[PDB]
Amino acid sequence: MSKQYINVNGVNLHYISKGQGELMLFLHGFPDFSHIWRHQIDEFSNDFHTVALDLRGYNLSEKPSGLESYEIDVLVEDIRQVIEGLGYSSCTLVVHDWGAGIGWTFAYRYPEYVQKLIAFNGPHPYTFMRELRTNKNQQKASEYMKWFQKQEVQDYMERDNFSGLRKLVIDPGVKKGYLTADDVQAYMNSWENGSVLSMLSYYRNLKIFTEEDLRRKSLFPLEEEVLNIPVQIIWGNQDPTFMPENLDGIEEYVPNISVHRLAEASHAPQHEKPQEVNNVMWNFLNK
Numbered sequence: 001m002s003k004q005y006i007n008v009n010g011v012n013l014h015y016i017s018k019g020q021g022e023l024m025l026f027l028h029g030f031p032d033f034s035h036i037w038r039h040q041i042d043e044f045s046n047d048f049h050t051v052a053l054d055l056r057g058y059n060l061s062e063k064p065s066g067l068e069s070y071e072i073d074v075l076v077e078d079i080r081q082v083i084e085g086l087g088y089s090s091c092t093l094v095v096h097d098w099g100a101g102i103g104w105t106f107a108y109r110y111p112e113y114v115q116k117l118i119a120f121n122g123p124h125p126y127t128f129m130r131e132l133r134t135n136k137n138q139q140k141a142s143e144y145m146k147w148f149q150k151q152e153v154q155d156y157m158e159r160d161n162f163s164g165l166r167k168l169v170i171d172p173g174v175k176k177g178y179l180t181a182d183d184v185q186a187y188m189n190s191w192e193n194g195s196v197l198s199m200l201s202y203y204r205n206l207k208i209f210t211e212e213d214l215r216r217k218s219l220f221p222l223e224e225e226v227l228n229i230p231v232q233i234i235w236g237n238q239d240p241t242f243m244p245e246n247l248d249g250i251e252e253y254v255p256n257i258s259v260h261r262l263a264e265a266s267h268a269p270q271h272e273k274p275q276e277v278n279n280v281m282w283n284f285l286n287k
C-alpha cells in the first residue's frame with residue numbers, strides 16, 4: 001500500500017495505491033475519504049492497480065479557497081486528469097455519495113474513459129432530480145442539504161471533537177461493528193487534516209434550491225441522457241440519505257445496468273458488508 005500526491009487541474013491530490021495493471025479508481029463522498037475503500041483495495045489489488053483518491057478539500061488533498069474551486073466542472077476535470085496522470089486512457093470507476101454525483105456525471109460526459117462503472121448509494125443525475133421533485137420521503141431525507149447552505153453548519157460538525165461528524169458516521173459504524181479502533185482514528189485524523197469548509201463547499205454550489213433549478217432534468221448539466229457502458233449498482237436499502245426509489249426506472253438512463261440491493265445495509269455498503277459487496281463486484285467484473 002502506497003500513499004502519494006498527484007498534481008492535476010491546479011491542485012495536489014493525495015491518493016492511496018496498491019497493485020498494478022488496469023486502473024480501478026475509487027471516489028468517496030461526504031464525510032469520508034480514501035480509507036472507506038480499504039476492503040476493495042485489499043480485495044482487488046492483485047487484479048487491478050487500485051487507487052482511492054482523496055477528493056479536493058478532503059483529508060490530505062489540497063484545499064483551494066473559494067466556492068468556484070468546488071464546482072462540478074472542476075471536479076469532473078480532476079477525475080479526467082487523474083486518470084491520464086496515472087498513465088491511463090480509461091478505468092474501472094467505483095463511486096459512492098459525492099463521488100457518485102461526480103462519477104456519474106463524469107461517465108455520462110466521458111464514456112470513453114470508463115470501461116465499467118460500479119456505483120454505491122448516491123445520486124444518479126436524472127433519477128435524483130425526479131425523486132426530489134415528487135418523492136416526499138426523498139425531499140424530507142434531503143432537507144439537510146438546505147441546512148448545509150448555512151454558515152452555522154461547520155460548528156455543529158466540528159465542535160466537541162467533531163461531535164456532529166462522529167454522530168453521523170462513527171457511532172453507527174462502531175455500534176454495528178464495521179469500524180475498528182484504527183478506522184475511527186483514521187477518520188478523526190482525516191477531519192483534522194482535511195477541511196470541513198471545503199467539504200461543505202461542494203454542497204454550496206448545488207442548483208436544487210430555486211423552483212427554476214429544481215425544474216432541470218439532471219442534477220448537474222448533461223447533454224447525454226443515456227449511458228451505455230456496463231454499470232453495476234450496489235445499494236443499501238436502509239440508507240437514510242437516498243430513498244430506494246432513486247433506482248426506479250433507472251434502465252431508461254442506463255440500459256446495460258445490473259442492480260444489487262442489500263436489504264439491511266445502509267449508506268455505505270462497501271465497508272458495511274465488504275464480503276457481500278466484493279463478490280457482487282467480482283461477478284460484475286467477470287460478466
Ligand SMILES: NC(=O)COc1ccccc1
Nearest residue numbers: 030031097098101123241
Ligand atoms: N452524504 C451526503 O450528504 C451527500 O449527499 C449528496 C451527495 C452528492 C450530491 C448531492 C447530495
Ligand SMILES: NC(=O)COc1ccccc1
Nearest residue numbers: 132133139142143145208
Ligand atoms: N419539496 C421540493 O420540491 C424541494 O425539496 C427539496 C429540494 C432540495 C433540497 C431538499 C429538498
Ligand SMILES: NC(=O)COc1ccccc1
Nearest residue numbers: 030031168169172266267
Ligand atoms: N455519510 C452520511 O451522510 C451518512 O452516513 C451514514 C449514514 C447512515 C449509516 C452509515 C453512514
